[PDB]
Amino acid sequence: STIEELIKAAKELKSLGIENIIIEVKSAEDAKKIAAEGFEKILVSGPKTEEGIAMAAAAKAAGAKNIIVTARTAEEALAALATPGVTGVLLTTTAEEAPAALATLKAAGYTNVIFRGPSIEEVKKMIEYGAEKVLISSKDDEEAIKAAAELKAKGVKNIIVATRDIEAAKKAYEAGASSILLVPDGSW
Ligand SMILES: [Cl-]
Ligand SMILES: [Cl-]
């Protein structure tokens, strides 16, 4: 789907009262556009954290509020978190490495790190190790929405659910997701 389609869907969600949304972007031009539109939480996602950092600069210059950068190591997370205007990181890691990553980020004074993993099982391991914010995603979204609701009922807070169309976004909201991530490769 195109960026205009994603903007329309995000505005529709907001008009329904669904305000706890995060917009994912994959280029600096899109980051500027989403920020200029006034969306309050933007995920900048590039293959390399350096590309995300350049997108964060474009979003900040266009007025962004909260900017989350993707990373796959603790070192990359620290580089992003130290960048002006960046307010959080989405760290793709494994349960094996999460203890060390958590300790490293904490010692540096950073807490706003969202963990994601390759399987819902590994994400549950990350929560056990002390991950306080997680992102759940699945091929069909329905699996992710169900897992988030189960964890929420087990007392887990700050679950972000990735969604690929507006029906899934609404279901994730209704199930109590802390935030809903709108992924651009979806059907909007
Ligand atoms: Cl605009
Ligand atoms: Cl918003």
Side-chain angles (χ1 to χ4, degrees), residues 10 14 18-23 37-41:
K14 292 179 74 166
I18 299 173
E19 314 302 327
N20 58 328
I21 62 176
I22 304 175
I23 312 298
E37 288 271 359
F39 293 105
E40 300 278 62
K41 194 169 278 168

mmCIF file of all heavy atoms in Angstrom, residues 10 14 18-23 37-41, ligand 2:
data_model
loop_
_atom_site.group_PDB
_atom_site.id
_atom_site.type_symbol
_atom_site.label_atom_id
_atom_site.label_comp_id
_atom_site.label_asym_id
_atom_site.label_seq_id
_atom_site.Cartn_x
_atom_site.Cartn_y
_atom_site.Cartn_z
ATOM 1 N N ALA A 10 -4.902 5.709 9.094
ATOM 2 C CA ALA A 10 -4.553 6.213 10.416
ATOM 3 C C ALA A 10 -5.495 7.317 10.864
ATOM 4 O O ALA A 10 -5.906 7.357 12.035
ATOM 5 C CB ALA A 10 -3.110 6.702 10.426
ATOM 6 N N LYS A 14 -8.024 7.345 14.123
ATOM 7 C CA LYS A 14 -8.101 8.453 15.065
ATOM 8 C C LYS A 14 -9.535 8.970 15.186
ATOM 9 O O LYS A 14 -9.993 9.283 16.286
ATOM 10 C CB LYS A 14 -7.130 9.559 14.670
ATOM 11 C CG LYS A 14 -5.689 9.159 14.836
ATOM 12 C CD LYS A 14 -4.730 10.253 14.417
ATOM 13 C CE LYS A 14 -4.649 11.411 15.394
ATOM 14 N NZ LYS A 14 -3.453 12.256 15.081
ATOM 15 N N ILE A 18 -9.397 5.804 18.270
ATOM 16 C CA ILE A 18 -8.238 4.923 18.395
ATOM 17 C C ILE A 18 -7.011 5.796 18.166
ATOM 18 O O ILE A 18 -6.578 6.035 17.026
ATOM 19 C CB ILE A 18 -8.329 3.743 17.435
ATOM 20 C CG1 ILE A 18 -9.591 2.938 17.779
ATOM 21 C CG2 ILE A 18 -7.084 2.889 17.522
ATOM 22 C CD1 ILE A 18 -9.910 1.840 16.830
ATOM 23 N N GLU A 19 -6.445 6.302 19.264
ATOM 24 C CA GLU A 19 -5.359 7.263 19.188
ATOM 25 C C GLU A 19 -4.009 6.661 19.524
ATOM 26 O O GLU A 19 -2.988 7.314 19.293
ATOM 27 C CB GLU A 19 -5.591 8.425 20.167
ATOM 28 C CG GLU A 19 -6.984 9.017 20.163
ATOM 29 C CD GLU A 19 -7.397 9.533 18.809
ATOM 30 O OE1 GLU A 19 -6.524 10.008 18.062
ATOM 31 O OE2 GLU A 19 -8.613 9.466 18.496
ATOM 32 N N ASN A 20 -3.985 5.446 20.060
ATOM 33 C CA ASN A 20 -2.763 4.801 20.524
ATOM 34 C C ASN A 20 -2.085 4.047 19.375
ATOM 35 O O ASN A 20 -1.840 2.844 19.427
ATOM 36 C CB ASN A 20 -3.077 3.911 21.727
ATOM 37 C CG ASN A 20 -4.118 2.842 21.439
ATOM 38 O OD1 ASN A 20 -5.031 3.036 20.638
ATOM 39 N ND2 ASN A 20 -4.021 1.730 22.127
ATOM 40 N N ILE A 21 -1.764 4.803 18.322
ATOM 41 C CA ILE A 21 -1.209 4.259 17.083
ATOM 42 C C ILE A 21 0.224 4.738 16.890
ATOM 43 O O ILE A 21 0.615 5.824 17.331
ATOM 44 C CB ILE A 21 -2.072 4.559 15.833
ATOM 45 C CG1 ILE A 21 -2.186 6.055 15.582
ATOM 46 C CG2 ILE A 21 -3.453 3.976 15.997
ATOM 47 C CD1 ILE A 21 -2.935 6.402 14.303
ATOM 48 N N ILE A 22 1.010 3.896 16.229
ATOM 49 C CA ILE A 22 2.381 4.186 15.815
ATOM 50 C C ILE A 22 2.441 3.954 14.322
ATOM 51 O O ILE A 22 2.007 2.904 13.840
ATOM 52 C CB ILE A 22 3.373 3.259 16.535
ATOM 53 C CG1 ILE A 22 3.196 3.380 18.044
ATOM 54 C CG2 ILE A 22 4.798 3.588 16.115
ATOM 55 C CD1 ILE A 22 4.032 2.424 18.844
ATOM 56 N N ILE A 23 2.989 4.910 13.585
ATOM 57 C CA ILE A 23 3.076 4.813 12.137
ATOM 58 C C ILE A 23 4.493 4.405 11.771
ATOM 59 O O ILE A 23 5.446 5.106 12.124
ATOM 60 C CB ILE A 23 2.744 6.151 11.459
ATOM 61 C CG1 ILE A 23 1.455 6.717 12.041
ATOM 62 C CG2 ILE A 23 2.727 5.992 9.938
ATOM 63 C CD1 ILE A 23 0.275 5.846 11.824
ATOM 64 N N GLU A 37 2.216 15.583 8.904
ATOM 65 C CA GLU A 37 0.805 15.301 9.126
ATOM 66 C C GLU A 37 0.423 15.350 10.595
ATOM 67 O O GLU A 37 -0.774 15.312 10.902
ATOM 68 C CB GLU A 37 0.439 13.929 8.548
ATOM 69 C CG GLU A 37 0.395 13.846 7.025
ATOM 70 C CD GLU A 37 -0.968 14.196 6.452
ATOM 71 O OE1 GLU A 37 -1.879 14.491 7.240
ATOM 72 O OE2 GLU A 37 -1.116 14.165 5.217
ATOM 73 N N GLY A 38 1.391 15.410 11.507
ATOM 74 C CA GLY A 38 1.085 15.552 12.910
ATOM 75 C C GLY A 38 0.954 14.267 13.699
ATOM 76 O O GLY A 38 0.540 14.320 14.863
ATOM 77 N N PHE A 39 1.298 13.120 13.121
ATOM 78 C CA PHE A 39 1.218 11.877 13.873
ATOM 79 C C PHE A 39 2.252 11.874 14.989
ATOM 80 O O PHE A 39 3.410 12.257 14.790
ATOM 81 C CB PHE A 39 1.399 10.685 12.942
ATOM 82 C CG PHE A 39 0.274 10.526 11.961
ATOM 83 C CD1 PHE A 39 0.418 10.872 10.636
ATOM 84 C CD2 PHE A 39 -0.948 10.042 12.389
ATOM 85 C CE1 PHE A 39 -0.647 10.714 9.755
ATOM 86 C CE2 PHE A 39 -1.994 9.895 11.521
ATOM 87 C CZ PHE A 39 -1.843 10.231 10.207
ATOM 88 N N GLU A 40 1.816 11.443 16.160
ATOM 89 C CA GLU A 40 2.558 11.663 17.387
ATOM 90 C C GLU A 40 3.628 10.622 17.657
ATOM 91 O O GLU A 40 4.536 10.900 18.449
ATOM 92 C CB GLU A 40 1.593 11.681 18.575
ATOM 93 C CG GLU A 40 0.521 12.765 18.522
ATOM 94 C CD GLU A 40 1.026 14.110 19.006
ATOM 95 O OE1 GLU A 40 1.958 14.653 18.377
ATOM 96 O OE2 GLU A 40 0.498 14.623 20.020
ATOM 97 N N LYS A 41 3.555 9.429 17.067
ATOM 98 C CA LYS A 41 4.541 8.388 17.338
ATOM 99 C C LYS A 41 4.891 7.715 16.023
ATOM 100 O O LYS A 41 4.023 7.121 15.373
ATOM 101 C CB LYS A 41 4.021 7.383 18.378
ATOM 102 C CG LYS A 41 5.096 6.457 18.977
ATOM 103 C CD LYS A 41 4.588 5.682 20.181
ATOM 104 C CE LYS A 41 4.652 6.529 21.440
ATOM 105 N NZ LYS A 41 3.889 5.901 22.560
HETATM 106 CL CL CL B 2 -1.289 10.385 16.175
#
